[PDB]
Design a protein around this ligand. Structure first.
Ligand SMILES: [Cl-]
Ligand SMILES: [Fe+3]
Ligand SMILES: [Fe+3]
Ligand SMILES: [Fe+3]
Ligand SMILES: [Fe+3]
Ligand SMILES: [Fe+3]
Ligand SMILES: [Fe+3]
Ligand SMILES: [Mg+2]
Ligand SMILES: [Zn+2]
Lengths: 172, 172, 172, 172, 172, 172
């Protein structure tokens, strides 16, 4: 038991370790999405940059939870990171729809984490989660929703023209 | 029979002269393509600029091979340069398709040149081809392929709208 | 078969995908190392920073390989990234010794990759591995080696004083 | 018939296509000459630079005629470019002498082309020729005459010292 | 066996020790030549500066090979450096001629060393040789060839004026 | 038999040639020492830099004596340069001890040279030795002696900690 550990429940500790794994997973998925758009047969540069940026942000959220684990005197245990569910993400619109689903999954996880911390009367952990994660997730979700909407409204994915113009006028 | 010549095989010297002619021919193809886009009945300014830039770069590659030839104590023998295959390149997509085929043809020659140099045990030449030619070719081919992909996905060569917006948003 | 693909063997494609996974695994080991030194009961900030920088460098090497795979017309196929071999890296010296061993494993894989590219007569791919990977590995292996020696000579991992002073004067 | 075409005779259009071929040929002659002076057994760097400059100028003159052909609604038809007359240009003076002869052949062609424009009452074309070509020709011919004179009175071609010194003081 | 050693053949290690000796010898030859031109009865200051520069470059090439030997886990064994072949280098042209011969002997040694690296499948070593040595050699040999040519056509060595003027206009 | 020669005795001329060889040898010793510190199993960067700097300075002293030789109308006669006494210099303390011995040896030679110059009534030479060599030697010897003293007092060569902290706080 760490010399710094105080009011930090073993269930919170384990759940932080589960959240680190999920973030690393989200990072990997966004990486895969990014380089799908860099394919010579997809060729959507700003989709590629957009996803690569989300991949780097998810990694940073992982690192920030590992930092938190050590700050509170928990112990980091890393697990296998599963490969993403697809190799070929099919289109700009389908990839955005999948990212929206993925972010809502990560949000559901973060909401269960905040609820756990609440039940364990861990206001530090609660505030950490609210300040650094919950509003970032709401914002990402809103932006992905907006992007899905525009693409659909523009005629994706049957219009490859819509995907191209979207890449240029929104993502660029 | 040059004072500077060393480990430079006569078959290498001749391959280099053939390459110089090929780079010059490619330069001429891109010249023709460029001024097809400058026609009043085609009128795609950024297609014209793009292909003119490629024309200038091919000529640079040719000059740099002439420079290599003398650096090694080879002798330059210049040949007739054949006119391009078409006078009318039909469309932006079809010009890009042709460029891509041409670049792969040039790359094929450069690969065959590297292999000769490797059989003749000429590492200076290998490296020169590697450093200046092979990565440039791979980048040119990927770029062309990306441009073809976008043009097809946008609805070319059906859509004259596709070619126009591509000219503006990708090539400008 | 991708329209940009040329002189790019299916074996090379497969090997580039294995190398991507190895680099991602290496990134994850250094990630683990970093946050081990951030523990309140280890508390060597510059060992932590040092390892976190190697984790980000490894990720960037994975990403540059993904880019090359697309550049050449191959297709990325990502796999599960296994967790690192340890949770607890014991000491500054033992993490360095493990890291030397990891880099030497990655270097072996890259040399096998180069030998394959050579056997497939892929000089573009040979030169990309030479230019972007092999000298970097040799630099990294040399530096890790230096660091292992210095810690040994100072009396690590026996001397916690030696790990602390090395953290300040070399890694700071 | 192009929608832009006005007061542009078919013979004029044909004559511009010939002049384009000749300017590209003149470019290639100067390119040959430039790299003759770059040889290790000739080694006059300022002669090389001077003829390479000429070569690039001549290409620019050709591209400007291509621009004109499109401006007026004519159609460009490119032809084979024949290799120059010599592989070996023999000395500084001899190359200057051959360039002067070349330049006066280009000029005669241009005066023939201006005569034709006058016969077809194409003032635009006459003025384009005047303003962009005839006075550049007259200047180039005088410059070349001046150079040939200086090399002669310096004792070229029986003086390699004469050619070296002119390389340095006039061409450098 | 060094803890850094990997894929580095004993013969390679031995060949690098020989190349180090030869580069130091080439340094000393150019040092001798430099101060020959500093004598009151020769007095060509730009030849002196030129050969002193060469001397320092050759020392740098030797130090870089020493750096390499350590990078790869090899061990440096230094040998006697034999005095150069002449005390008196006779004229500007003759010294340039001997330097060219020297440089082509260094180059042959380097190509022999690159052959060996290839036979031992050491791509790192091959690339180090290519990137730091073979193209510097090829450049130095061309430069020297150019100089010897100019001095010859200027009437050296039967013209002390020729050597003085080249000192000033080429080497100054 | 130089036009510039005046009050310059043949015994002075020969002593100067011997000194030049000694400065060159010393330069080589410091080279060897420097790259011993650059070994992965020694790994003392500021020791390596220090001894490389001394190597460069000895070579400068040698060049300056070559310059003196010609200034006086002497003739330079270069000799073989012997390899250093050791390949392995064992430790920072032991290398410093050896440097100190070497510097005293060189100083001995320079003192004997000054005394000859004084017997030959050559005040220009006396002063040259005094101004450029003797105070530099005395400073080098004092510095080396200070470095040895610190290293012994810190606990070298027992303590690998001593050598490390000295590298950082004195030589960095
Ligand atoms: Cl638009
Ligand atoms: Fe997240
Ligand atoms: Fe090219
Ligand atoms: Fe890596
Ligand atoms: Fe012209
Ligand atoms: Fe060298
Ligand atoms: Fe000295
Ligand atoms: Mg290479
Ligand atoms: Zn727009």
């Amino acid at each position: 038991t760490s010399q710094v550990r105080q009011n930090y429940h073993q269930d919170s500790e384990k759940a932080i370790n589960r959240q680190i794994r999920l973030e690393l997973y989200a990072s990997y998925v966004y990486l895969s999405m990014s380089y799908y758009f860099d394919r010579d047969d997809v060729a959507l540069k700003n989709f590629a940059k957009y996803f690569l940026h989300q991949s780097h942000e998810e990694r940073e959220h992982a690192e920030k939870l590992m930092k938190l684990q050590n700050q509170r005197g928990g112990r980091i245990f890393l697990q296998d990171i599963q490969k993403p569910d697809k190799d070929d993400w099919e289109s700009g619109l389908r990839a955005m729809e999948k990212a929206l689903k993925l972010e809502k999954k990560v949000n559901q996880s973060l909401l269960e984490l905040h609820k756990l911390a609440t039940k364990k009367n861990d206001p530090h952990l609660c505030d950490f989660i609210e300040t650094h994660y919950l509003n970032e997730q709401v914002k990402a979700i809103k932006e992905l929703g907006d992007h899905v909407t525009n693409l659909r409204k523009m005629g994706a994915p049957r219009s490859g023209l819509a995907e191209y113009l979207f890449d240029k006028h929104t993502l660029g």
